[PDB]
């Protein structure tokens, strides 16, 4: 999940967020950034006590496993 070291993410497949988004910056929540090079930065913040914006990050690796991050109002003081 997130970014498997033993399973390099495939740079020719679709790395996106579930909504089809490319970056989601919410103040305090972090930034998830994908660039067309096929590389994505999953940068979450589990120190953000508040209300994160509901977004699911989804990129598939070489095998095709979607490494995801699911942010929702539950994932605050966790």
TrEMBL record:
Protein name: Surface-associated protein CshA
Span covered, complete protein: 2053 to 2130 of 2507
């Amino acid at each position: 999940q997130g970014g498997d070291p033993l399973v390099p993410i495939d740079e020719t497949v679709e790395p996106t967020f579930e909504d089809g988004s490319k970056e989601k910056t919410i103040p305090g929540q972090g930034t998830y950034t994908i660039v067309p090079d096929g590389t994505v930065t999953f940068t979450p913040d589990k120190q953000f006590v508040g209300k994160p914006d509901p977004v699911t990050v989804k990129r598939v690796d070489k095998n095709g496993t979607p490494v995801t991050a699911t942010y929702s109002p539950e994932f605050t003081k966790v």
